[PDB]
Design a protein around this ligand. Structure first.
Ligand SMILES: [As]
Ligand SMILES: [Zn+2]
Length: 193
DNA sequence: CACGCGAGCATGGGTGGGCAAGCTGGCTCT
DNA sequence: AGAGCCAGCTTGCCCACCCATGCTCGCGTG
């Protein structure tokens, strides 16, 4: 019945967690990436056990604040009309995946929420993780889109059957100056949090 | 013994200060 | 000689205070 997807961490039986390696900088204190518009934001997928064949990785944005949570996260009308299309991403989608030949962009028939899915691929031998390159195609501040409202990215590991294997999430701010903004927010947390 | 009146209250709204956040300007760098 | 920084600027927006205005309340009246 809910149209709001869960943001609850579920590291699950496979021991699923994310890693993060200026265009992009991660704050572990905030669990929050600070990204520039349309720039690569690499996210690592770590598991303790190997998911089954046909496992998929989905990413979806939701507004972080209770008052906005039920509103679907979409690109603003300016960026939507911008001719920055890679050929596969529908222009209303905020989150894209770059560098994957099997990306699928979904628009939920019931909830109208946008997601982007790629096959899960096990790390190379001797590698601890697999990396997916996401891009956020609007600033947090975009008038008529996010409009300065913080978002969470929800990453789910899903079997081909649709069972939830794992779920992790991190906040995102897409902004002109990620370094400045990370420092500001961390100082605000230490001083007034 | 119902009503009239002046005092004060409640409650949405305005205002000024400060903040947020893309952007510009100069140096520096290569 | 184009480009990268870093500081500072710009500008919508937030926030707290105060105001605005219908209504309540106790007094006194008729
Ligand atoms: As990023
Ligand atoms: Zn936008």
């Amino acid at each position: 019945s809910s149209s709001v997807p869960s943001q609850k961490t579920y590291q699950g039986s496979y021991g699923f967690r994310l890693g993060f390696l200026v265009t992009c900088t991660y704050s572990p204190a905030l669990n929050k990436t600070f990204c520039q518009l349309a720039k690569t934001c690499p996210v690592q997928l770590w598991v303790d056990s190997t998911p089954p064949p046909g496992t998929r990785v989905r990413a979806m944005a939701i507004y972080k604040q209770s008052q906005h949570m039920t509103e679907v996260v979409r690109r603003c009308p300016h960026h939507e009309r911008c001719s920055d299309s890679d050929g596969l991403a529908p222009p209303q989608h905020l989150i894209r995946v770059e560098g994957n030949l099997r990306v699928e962009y979904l628009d939920d028939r019931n909830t109208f929420r946008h997601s982007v899915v790629v096959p899960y691929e096990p790390p190379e031998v001797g590698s601890d993780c697999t990396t997916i390159h996401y891009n956020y195609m609007c600033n947090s501040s975009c008038m008529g889109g996010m409009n300065r409202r913080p978002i969470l990215t929800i990453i789910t590991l899903e079997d081909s059957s649709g069972n939830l294997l794992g779920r992790n999430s991190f906040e995102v701010r897409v902004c002109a100056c990620p370094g400045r903004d990370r420092r500001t927010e961390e100082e605000n947390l230490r001083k007034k949090g």
